[PDB]
Amino acid sequence: RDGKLAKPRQLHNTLWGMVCPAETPEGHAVGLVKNLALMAYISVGSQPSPILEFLEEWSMENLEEISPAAIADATKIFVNGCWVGIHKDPEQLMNTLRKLRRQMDIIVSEVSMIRDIREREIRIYTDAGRICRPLLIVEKQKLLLKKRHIDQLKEREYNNYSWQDLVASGVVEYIDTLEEETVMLAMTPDDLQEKEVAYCSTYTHCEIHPSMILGVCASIIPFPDHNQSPRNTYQSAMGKQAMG
Amino acid sequence: FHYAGVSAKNVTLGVPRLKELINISKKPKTPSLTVFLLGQSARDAERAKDILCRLEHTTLRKVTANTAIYYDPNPQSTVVAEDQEWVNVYYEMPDFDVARISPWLLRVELDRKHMTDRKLTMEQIAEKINAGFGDDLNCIFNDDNAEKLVLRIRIMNSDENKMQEEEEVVDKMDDDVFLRCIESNMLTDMTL
Amino acid sequence: ESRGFVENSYLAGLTPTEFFFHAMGGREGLIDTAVKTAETGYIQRRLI
């Protein structure tokens, strides 16, 4: 806290959807103590062995003969660190990995797979510390979530349909900050996915609701978008002090 | 930040500038100097630009488009095709080749835009290099009319013939390593 | 819109991206205040 540098405290862009922008303590700890957003989840950790076995099965020749070769072998498959070889086809590998994430065979919902198309690296991180959030999945310009899923969730009790079934169906997906760097998001389905003057026609995900970017204390603020920003921080601090 | 941009020069203000003044720090964050022009140069923009050029530090790197080192066995050989003409001209009445010539050639090529922006002259640059380094570096300069501004630098003629050194016949820093050291020195320390 | 301009008024209500960018600006102001207090206090003590 003693350090007066105004770099580590500032609200970074990557905090979107995973740490509350409003809720921070004021004083020596401005921006140094943060609070999770409402829908944020933190990875618990997993064994990388099944992912490595799948990669070995697909291709990912390791101990190759200087095959990168100006990255002719598109992408180098990384895991939690540990360059484990490289593949000639990166897009087929990425698509197969996403399908496996849906079927939940080798990839738990938390397993994070990032391909950097330029620089040609795929990172595949499962390291027990990543903070991720649920996002709806957009195929073409259509959300995968449909009336069947919503109707079953609406009957949630005595229908034995829950959020985990929504994840298993492949309708929603957990995305961490590294994957948030490689994903085109839409705030709302109707306003953005639908055909208009085409800003983007390659949306890959959709926000479940924007208001989930706020934390617990900032979520009680009514009409927070009509207040000045420091006032929402003040209300977070003061709502931690209300009597009830 | 939020300082009004009267000019394109940043200035420390506020608490940090008060700290600098109060502490009498030897190194100000933004040391600046306001210069007022005495004569008609103040009124006329071209003379003011002349003063600006005279007051602004310019290294050879700032005006150098690209530098190359070619091993040229003979000056008449002209390994680079382009210099074959002007080298010939300079060797129609060769000067300082009596001792010897360096087998290595530093063919610096200057950007015309930077040269004309700073209003530098090929004779000016050549004089600075040759005089400051001494007779050891011999420089051949192109005409400004030529499309490429080329300066051909060679190591000491007497040092190449080794009659002047006498002592022991042992290469010091070879010649190409010495030429690379010279190139770095010219790039960052010419102060044209 | 991409780089931070907020065209909506407070009465109209900021859109979500504008809301996040506004939070970034407010955070910077708060950090400035908190950092300022200590440096100014040290200067004042030295002068006195």
Partner: peptide, 8 residues
């Protein structure tokens, strides 16, 4: 939060 010349 206003502009570049104002405040954040």
């Amino acid at each position: 939060i206003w502009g570049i010349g104002c405040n954040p």
